Design a protein around this ligand. Structure first.
Ligand SMILES: [Mg+2]
Ligand SMILES: [Mg+2]
Ligand SMILES: [Mg+2]
Ligand SMILES: [Mg+2]
Ligand SMILES: [Mg+2]
Ligand SMILES: [Mg+2]
Ligand SMILES: [Mg+2]
Ligand SMILES: [Mg+2]
Ligand SMILES: [Mg+2]
Ligand SMILES: [Mg+2]
Ligand SMILES: [Mg+2]
Ligand SMILES: [Mg+2]
Ligand SMILES: [Mg+2]
Ligand SMILES: [Mg+2]
Ligand SMILES: [Mg+2]
Ligand SMILES: [Mg+2]
Ligand SMILES: [Mg+2]
Ligand SMILES: [Mg+2]
Ligand SMILES: [Mg+2]
Ligand SMILES: [Mg+2]
Ligand SMILES: [Mg+2]
Ligand SMILES: [Mg+2]
Ligand SMILES: [Mg+2]
Ligand SMILES: [Mg+2]
Ligand SMILES: [Mg+2]
Ligand SMILES: [Mg+2]
Ligand SMILES: [Zn+2]
Lengths: 50, 155, 60, 207
RNA sequence: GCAAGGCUAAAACUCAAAGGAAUUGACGGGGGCCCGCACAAGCGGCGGAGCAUGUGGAUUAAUUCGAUGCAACGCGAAGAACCUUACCUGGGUUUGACAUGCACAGGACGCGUCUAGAGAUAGGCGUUCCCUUGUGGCCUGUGUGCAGGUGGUGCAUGGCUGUCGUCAGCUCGUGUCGUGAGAUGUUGGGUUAAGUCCCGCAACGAGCGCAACCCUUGUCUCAUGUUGCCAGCACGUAAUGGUGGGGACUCGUGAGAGACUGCCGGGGUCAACUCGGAGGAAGGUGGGGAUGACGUCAAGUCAUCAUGCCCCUUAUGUCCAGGGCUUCACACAUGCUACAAUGGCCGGUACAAAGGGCUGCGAUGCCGCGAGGUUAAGCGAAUCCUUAAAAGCCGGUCUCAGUUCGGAUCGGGGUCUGCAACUCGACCCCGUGAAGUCGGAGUCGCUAGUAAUCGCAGAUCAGCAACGCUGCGGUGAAUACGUUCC
């Protein structure tokens, strides 16, 4: 509801998107797996290594 | 509307009976979006129409509509401190509409059990000039032919 | 709300069903979302301000 | 009232978010200390004129970019208030904090610095029409400014009945999505209550 | 003067005005033109019944406060058994549940027991880290300022919001005209959804609005291949794309192409623009959203927060247990389920979309008529669960009855959540089977994937009074002569 009191019929719509990508299945070479995690990703990017 | 006339919608030919008059009847019977239900009523009543005559049913249907199409309607108009009815000429595709509404309407309050035998008996009684749908035809005509004195104010 | 009731809802109550939520900015007992911890009012200024990431106005 | 916030309407198109993190489970955790950092900074550093506060957090490492018109004041005598509030910013969150008090290039083409400067003058018994024309004429002297609106509303000089007045120069197209419209709100602490100062600055379309 | 009455003509007293012309607006049962589900033309309702929910009044110890023509009334409340809670009765407390500053005195705290409805009070115990070695932290004591107040004023206010109205308007700079308020520009001719644009003119410009920029849906191209897809290979067991694998098709989502009166014909000052084509997924704003100019209503909110005054401080602060906010001669309002055969019931079978999931989603198995219980796989998820969509289709039966319609109310028996289901939760089983047979004067919504009807999901949330609200897809109409009237 927009108003702080008694105006039910006036409303907002907020969303929250979340993007997913890069399901890459690279070779676990022990030379690479060091350099996979050396780079600083930005603050607004999450990463899992599963 | 203020901005002139609106385009009207084309009706596709009916597959069982190759006529657009049948598919214009199923849209009058249609309630609550039950169109496959509305077509079983119209197809079922037309099959019962040939079971009591032997004749093709849409020929019986067009004879039934020609006995209930009005030619003069009786639209109302106020002039001063009094009102009256002006007899005006029904354009033809309104008379198709206004007669299909009377067949569906007067057979929903008819004395049978199911809608198939209610609708079929009203079609057969209108193609002989007997039903209540035929009775509103001459009631519309006798009302409009009792007011020829007011046919000079036709907008 | 009243400042005693904001501290009471923060602590650990007797009979753990007796707990509830308040807005983390103004301490409002109603219309508090669980994803944010905020009421309907404090969600609306903070989303316009760009102060909580990922949230903006939707049109479709 | 009737007009939307100019920052949220252009969020994700023209302007940009202030908090830069991600939280799949620890979201209300992060918001509850987000609204505690911003209380501590806004109440205690108001002489410096905070433009805004950016908080980006990367896995138990929160970095606070706080902008001001006057970078030398909050540091003081080689960190007597800078690392002081940084100490109270670690007693707050329980985490090691990078702090950066940067700059403002022109603190006259910057709403929330223009709006704070007018309300500081409104809390000095200055005539309100005099304070509103200084902020406008100092802003149109800036190069990349094509328009400014300043609105003050409240009791406006100790009058009994509240009213609202606004001036404008240039063009402020609020209905334009491609426009770069800055926006500020600050609240004068006068002796007759509160006066809200609103500033809209138009700085070209899009880069 | 026959009369009606004419002529001459005061004052007491009372008021601070009474007037004249012009100006801007508002209004008219004035005029011209124009629009809008405004009417008409249609389709389905509401007002009658029963229940749900809010409100008026009444009641009560209290039924906390706010909202009150449109623009209050399934509104604040996106969840009142305790909590929430602001109210009532009663029991406690009083630098206090919370913050700091100053003055004298040294562990806070924790677990466990007893008392009490609880709050708290006590028997106990574990105990001073820090150099309470001076100096730190902390503690209550003891005060002091103070803290605290959902106490008042929305007619002192900020903020935020409704609203006229998503109506097409509202103004300014310079010039000119008028003693002046003011006028002109913004009028006139067309045209537009539009102060949209063109042509004229003592006006020339400019700004805020309109349009555009953004999101969503409608077609295509390129990139892309898992957890998604399966054309052609191989396995297909169990037919569970299950497997090797494929980049074809969809789809997912990045980047782009596309619609502009661009092209043709007629009309128009050759102009704006309009009527009709061609090509295209789409044609003149393609559909819908986001977006509320200057202001109006002393509109709403001091109970989101903030705040100026004002009041309370052994209480109008604050803790707790029970009760209330759910009462009930009535009245209104918004909905739901109905009054059946275009239907009910039973059996069989088909086709979605958008969402949720770790204090979780519970597949499978097993027990129960059933709500459920139990066991436990897989899954922070295009992977697993939610998840069987319901209408629909086909078959059978009922046979127009207050009924095999309706499912209120009441009797009995249960399950689950929770410390706790009496006041006052939902769901399940068996029994019971009320009013209601289409609704008076009146009144509402809707112009197309709309109305009508059918399910599914989310938020708040332990559970829920969810028939609400915000969304999602399924099936899918009837009409519009027209502008006289409201
Ligand atoms: Mg609760
Ligand atoms: Mg006059
Ligand atoms: Mg008029
Ligand atoms: Mg319309
Ligand atoms: Mg009508
Ligand atoms: Mg009723
Ligand atoms: Mg009340
Ligand atoms: Mg409503
Ligand atoms: Mg209670
Ligand atoms: Mg007000
Ligand atoms: Mg005008
Ligand atoms: Mg004028
Ligand atoms: Mg314009
Ligand atoms: Mg627009
Ligand atoms: Mg008022
Ligand atoms: Mg009021
Ligand atoms: Mg107060
Ligand atoms: Mg209580
Ligand atoms: Mg209530
Ligand atoms: Mg039944
Ligand atoms: Mg079935
Ligand atoms: Mg079983
Ligand atoms: Mg059947
Ligand atoms: Mg009866
Ligand atoms: Mg009957
Ligand atoms: Mg729930
Ligand atoms: Zn809040």
């Amino acid at each position: 509801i927009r108003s702080p009191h008694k105006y039910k019929d006036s409303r907002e719509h907020f969303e929250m998107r979340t993007h997913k990508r890069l399901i890459d299945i690279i070779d676990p070479t022990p030379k690479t797996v060091d350099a996979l995690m050396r780079i600083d990703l930005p603050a607004s990017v999450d990463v899992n290594i599963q | 509307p203020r901005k002139g006339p609106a385009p009207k919608r084309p009706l596709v030919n009916d597959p069982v009976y190759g006529s657009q008059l049948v598919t214009q009847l199923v849209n009058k019977v249609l309630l609550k979006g039950k169109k496959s239900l509305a077509e079983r009523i119209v197809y079922g009543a037309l099959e019962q129409a040939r079971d009591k005559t032997g004749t093709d049913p849409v020929i019986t249907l067009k004879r039934a509509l020609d006995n209930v199409k009005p030619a003069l309607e009786v639209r109302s108009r106020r002039v001063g401190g009094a009102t009256y009815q002006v007899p005006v000429e029904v354009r033809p595709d309104r008379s198709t509409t206004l007669a299909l509404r009377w067949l569906v309407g007067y057979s929903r309050q008819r004395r049978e059990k199911t809608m198939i035998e209610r609708l079929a008996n009203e079609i057969l009684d209108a193609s002989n000039g007997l039903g209540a749908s035929v009775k509103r035809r001459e009631d519309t005509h006798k009302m409009a032919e009792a007011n020829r004195a007011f046919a000079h104010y036709r907008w | 709300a009243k400042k005693a009731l904001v501290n009471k809802a923060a602590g650990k109550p007797r009979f753990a069903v007796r707990a509830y939520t308040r807005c983390s900015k103004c301490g409002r007992p109603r219309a508090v979302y669980r994803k944010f911890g905020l009421c309907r009012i404090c969600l609306r200024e903070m989303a316009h301000a760009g102060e909580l990431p990922g949230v903006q106005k939707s049109s479709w | 009232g009737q007009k939307i916030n100019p920052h949220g309407f252009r969020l994700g198109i023209t302007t940009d978010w202030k908090s830069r993190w991600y939280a799949d489970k620890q979201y209300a955790e992060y918001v509850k200390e987000d609204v505690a950092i911003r209380r501590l900074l806004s109440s205690g550093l108001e002489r410096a004129g905070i433009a805004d506060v950016e908080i980006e957090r990367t896995r138990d490492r929160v970095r606070v970019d706080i902008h001001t018109a006057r970078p030398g004041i909050v540091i003081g005598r080689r960190g007597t208030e800078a690392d002081r509030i940084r100490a109270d910013l670690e007693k707050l969150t329980g985490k090691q904090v990078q702090l950066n008090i940067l700059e403002v290039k022109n603190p006259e083409s910057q709403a929330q610095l223009v709006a704070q400067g007018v309300a500081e003058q409104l809390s000095n018994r200055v005539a309100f029409r005099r304070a509103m024309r200084k902020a406008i004429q100092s802003a149109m002297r800036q190069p990349n400014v094509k328009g400014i609106r300043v609105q003050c509303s409240g009791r406006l000089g100790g009058a009994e009945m509240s009213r609202s007045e606004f001036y404008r120069e240039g063009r402020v197209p609020l209905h334009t999505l491609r426009a770069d419209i800055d926006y500020g709100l600050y609240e004068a602490k006068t002796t007759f209550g509160r006066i809200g100062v609103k500033v809209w600055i138009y700085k070209g379309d899009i880069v």
